Design a protein around this nucleic acid. Structure first.
Lengths: 83, 201, 136, 131, 89, 163
RNA sequence: AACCAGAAAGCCACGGCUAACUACGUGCCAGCAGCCGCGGUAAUACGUAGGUGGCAAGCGUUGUCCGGAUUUAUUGGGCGUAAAGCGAGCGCAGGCGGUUUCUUAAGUCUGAUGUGAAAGCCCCCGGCUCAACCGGGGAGGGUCAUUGGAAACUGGGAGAC
RNA sequence: AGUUGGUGAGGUAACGGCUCACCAAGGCCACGAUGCAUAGCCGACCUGAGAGGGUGAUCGGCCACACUGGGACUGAGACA
């Protein structure tokens, strides 16, 4: 650790694939011309080891290196899970 | 050319003192052309502003293209007024230091003498007509031959030595005295139509 | 309107026309392409020349010529003045400008700018019509 | 549906000012009382009193009229209406009528005027003008 | 193969150079890394204005000045101080 | 308010109109002018009349115009603040300016502003352009113009904590 | 450095907008025009005459882009009759939301640090006998990036009326 | 439909469906995917009060092309 990466929060949508979850980070921007707070979403694909998290967990992830055919972050910590 | 007539037919249509009562009036105020013995209608407010501009153009003979740039830089103060400080900056010309102080007689004596290079200033020969003369700048009249008597023929009939620039005789030294106003230098009238002509030009 | 109705509508604009659409060559070589070519003037060859009558309230015989250009499009044109240096089957160079009382024409030719020559007596307005100044 | 209470409060002040009488009854809450205190210490209001049993307010407003039946508060309008929120940084703070009026800014320390805002280098959300 | 050298910035007949460090692949007036001092060709003696914490700390990084640049920067004895003072070790 | 005709005057004719009334047989036709009147120190007014010749019509307009006089409060020979006046389509924007920057105003509004003693101002017509409603909206806007000592003396507070 | 003002001035319009004229032969034809519009003994729109009127080796014309245009109006527009409330209802998704306690701090503001190449447009000062050329400084190039704080308002969680 | 993931091997200056062999059917989309058409991008330039609108030719930076389309070799470096 002589140089930091970028860590992102978010929750989980779907993880039907092996060793792989799907993380949605989420924020609000402005319209460039008008002014209200539009919201939007992305779908990352982060690598997991051994089926840790499930559907609906807030989890956080880190930028890693190119790990597969574009699934590129590593899971850190199941934070808050419900059923 | 910078002059395209007798300066009599052209200055008839205007008929103004030109400018600070340097008087040449013999038979100016009757009408030019061959509409002259007959009458004419009223004047639009565009025409009055046009005659104001053409008045301040046949006075000096200079250009449009430098009047704009000299007009812009009077907002360098930024706590004060523009066209008044423009009227200040309009007379720090090397031609204006000749005329409004008492270095020689007339503005065309200034400009003809500074059109070929027959003056010196500050240490070497110069030729630039529109030099931004500043405070403490001894302007000479080619001191290598300034003791020809026509120079001292010109110095004696003084235009005026106000508190904006002082004058000395023995060396022809002119130095900016104090920060003037409108009431002293060109008392006091003609400004209004020029700045109106250059607002939406 | 309101705000998020202007978000999901793009708030469009009011695209302008032109006035001289035969000065924008819809190309004819090699493979007969389109414009890149915003022009001040074109040339062409005349195909018939004659006269036509104007609208209300005027009453004369306005003289015209129909000229097909380089860009393979045919537009009628007007010929100015009394006495013309541009006639049947020659090069002719075009201005852009519409004559009002005539219907169905929006170009008139320049004349004095090619093979054509120009003025004879207008010593004050001699910019138009092609002829050098008599220098006395 | 009463989808904004602050605009209701401000239109009640304008409607009471326009037909020129002295009292005003407002079902009220915490931000309304705070901007009432802002206007009171800035004196656009003559006086306020507070009466609450269990519910919204009410705040009774004692308006101000001049000594020859003239009106001292002349207009009043919102800025950040709910749907287009408006935020102003600490060196974009407006100065209305060359400072002749004031402006209500909900800063990160609370609800103050613009002069107190520029004397702390804090922007924030602008609620409304009054002048 | 970095190489500190000149860069011509004239008008039409009156040049004005700036001593600048650039890779040799780059053109005469293209990019560089930094501008280390300058020199009027005209008006001998024209000044070598420097911070001179750059030349001393830049040839020590490893660079090679050209013909004119070395033969005017030898007037401050720059690397001779340095490889004199490589005995500091 | 009961307007004293004791200060000086100054005049400028804004516009004249030749105006008809069709009657049986011929056509009646009348002239009608529009003249603002001021002292260029803070009392300006306007008025209009109509007649069948220009000098009598402008005499009637001046004679009408001497019954309306307006404050036009000043500070530093410039408006205190922003003014937007509205009268039947005359939206007229006015705004204080920098010292010496001139008058930025067209025909039927420069004659109002210059004849009151203002030299640092911006203006823009916005909507109506017929010369009567422009002048009426101009004076309607200047009527809305407030004053420093007024606003400082209205509330129980004083001046110099609001500047 | 010996002698000259000699070698050495140009171009389009004048019915209104449009400041910038008067008069002569031309005769609903020949013609002119950016818009309004002129032509049958008048064209103050063809030629002539002096003028008049404009920038400083130029001057008119064609074509293209921005302004004036609040004539896409966020700043900054509207819908009774002028263009413009669907023939009317039920409702998925979406937009927006009563009062209050605690709490997170996504949005919020702010301190410090890193960068926003060189040349440009600026400003100050020098030289180029004044245009152009170079020099050192600064807002100028972020909705930036990291690190530290506030919980007033809107999101979020636990509750309360 | 090598499309998305896992296992193993090969290969590359190195990670990786980049390529193979096997197993499971995944992935992207109204926050506009896929399809058609136009266009090199930027410092900047013109214009405007400003928000903006238009353009990317002189000079500087990057990318891409060598009659048209493929393919390798030498070489630290080219698919020249």
């Amino acid at each position: 650790e002589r140089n930091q990466r970028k860590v992102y929060q978010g929750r989980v949508v779907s993880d039907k694939m092996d060793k792989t979850i799907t993380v949605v980070v989420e924020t609000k921007k402005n319209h460039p011309i008008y002014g209200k707070r539009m919201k939007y979403s992305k779908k990352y694909k982060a690598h997991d080891e051994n089926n840790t998290a499930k559907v609906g967990d807030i989890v956080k992830i880190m930028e890693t290196r190119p790990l597969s055919a574009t699934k590129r972050f590593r899971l850190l910590e199941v934070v808050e899970e419900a059923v | 050319s910078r002059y395209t007539g007798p300066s009599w037919k052209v200055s008839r249509r205007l008929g103004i003192s030109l400018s600070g009562t340097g008087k040449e009036l013999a038979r100016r105020p009757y009408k030019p052309g061959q509409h002259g013995p007959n009458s004419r209608g009223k004047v639009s407010e565009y025409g009055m502003q046009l005659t104001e501009k053409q008045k301040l153009r046949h006075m000096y003979g200079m250009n449009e293209r430098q009047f704009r740039t000299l007009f812009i830089k009077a907002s360098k103060i930024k706590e004060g007024k523009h066209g008044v400080n423009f009227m200040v900056l309009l007379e720090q010309r090397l031609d204006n230091v000749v005329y409004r102080l008492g270095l020689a007689t007339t503005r065309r004596q200034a400009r003809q003498l500074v059109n070929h290079g027959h003056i010196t200033v500050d240490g070497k020969r110069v030729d630039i007509p529109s030099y931004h003369v500043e405070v403490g700048q001894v302007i000479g009249v080619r001191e290598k031959s300034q003791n020809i008597s026509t120079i001292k023929e010109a110095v004696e009939a003084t235009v005026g030595r106000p508190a904006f620039v002082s004058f000395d005789t023995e060396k022809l030294e002119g130095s900016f005295t104090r920060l003037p106003e409108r009431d002293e230098l060109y008392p006091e009238i003609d400004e209004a139509l020029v700045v109106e002509y250059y607002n939406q030009k | 309107p309101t705000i998020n109705q202007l978000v999901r509508k793009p708030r469009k604009s009011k695209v302008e026309k032109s006035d001289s659409p035969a000065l924008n060559k819809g190309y004819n070589s090699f493979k007969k392409t389109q414009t890149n070519v915003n022009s001040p003037q074109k040339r062409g060859v005349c195909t018939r020349v004659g006269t036509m009558t104007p609208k209300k309230p005027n009453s004369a015989l306005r003289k015209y010529a129909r000229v097909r250009l380089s860009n393979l499009i045919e537009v009628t044109a007007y010929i100015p003045g009394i006495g013309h240096n541009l006639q049947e089957h020659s090069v002719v160079l075009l201005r852009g400008g519409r004559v009002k009382d005539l219907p169905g024409v929006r170009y008139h030719i320049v004349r004095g700018a090619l093979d054509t020559a120009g003025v004879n007596d207008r010593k004050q307005s001699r910019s138009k019509y092609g002829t050098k100044r008599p220098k006395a | 549906v009463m989808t904004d209470p602050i605009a209701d409060f401000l239109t009640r002040i304008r409607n009471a000012n326009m037909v020129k009488h002295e009292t005003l009854e407002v079902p009220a809450s915490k931000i309304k009382r705070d901007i009432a205190e802002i206007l009171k210490r800035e004196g656009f209001i003559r006086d306020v009193e507070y009466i609450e049993d269990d519910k919204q307010g009410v705040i009774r407003v004692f308006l101000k009229y001049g000594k020859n039946e003239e009106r001292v508060i002349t207009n009043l309008k919102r800025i950040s209406k709910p749907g287009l929120r408006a935020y102003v940084k600490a060196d974009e703070v407006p100065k209305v009528l060359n400072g002749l009026g004031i402006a209500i800014i909900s800063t990160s320390e609370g609800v103050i005027t613009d002069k107190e805002a520029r004397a702390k280098n804090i922007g924030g959300e602008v609620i409304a003008y009054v002048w | 193969a970095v190489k500190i050298r000149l860069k011509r910035m004239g008008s039409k007949k009156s040049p004005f150079y700036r001593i600048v460090v650039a890779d040799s692949r780059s053109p005469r007036d293209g990019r560089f890394i930094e501008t280390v001092g300058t020199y009027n060709p005209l008006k001998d003696p024209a000044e070598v204005v420097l911070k001179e914490d750059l030349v001393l700390d830049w040839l020590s990084k490893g660079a090679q000045p050209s013909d004119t640049v070395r033969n005017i920067l030898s007037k401050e004895g720059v690397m001779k101080k340095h490889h004199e003072a490589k005995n500091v070790k | 308010y009961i307007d004293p005709k004791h200060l000086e005057l100054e005049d400028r004719v804004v516009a004249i109109n030749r105006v008809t009334k069709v009657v049986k047989g011929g056509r009646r036709l009348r002239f009608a002018a529009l003249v603002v009147v001021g002292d260029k120190n803070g009392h300006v007014g306007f008025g209009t009349g109509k007649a069948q010749e220009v000098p009598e019509a402008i005499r009637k307009a001046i004679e009408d115009a001497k019954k309306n006089l307006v404050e036009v409060p000043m500070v530093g020979s410039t408006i205190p603040h922003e003014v937007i006046g509205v009268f039947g389509g005359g939206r007229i924007l006015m705004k204080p300016a920098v010292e010496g920057s001139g008058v930025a105003a067209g025909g039927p509004v420069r004659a109002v502003l210059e004849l009151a003693g203002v030299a640092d101002i911006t203006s823009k017509s916005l909507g109506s352009n017929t010369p009567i409603n422009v002048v009426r909206a101009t004076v309607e806007g200047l009527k809305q113009l407030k004053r420093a000592e007024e606003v400082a003396a209205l509330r129980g507070k004083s001046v110099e904590e609001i500047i």
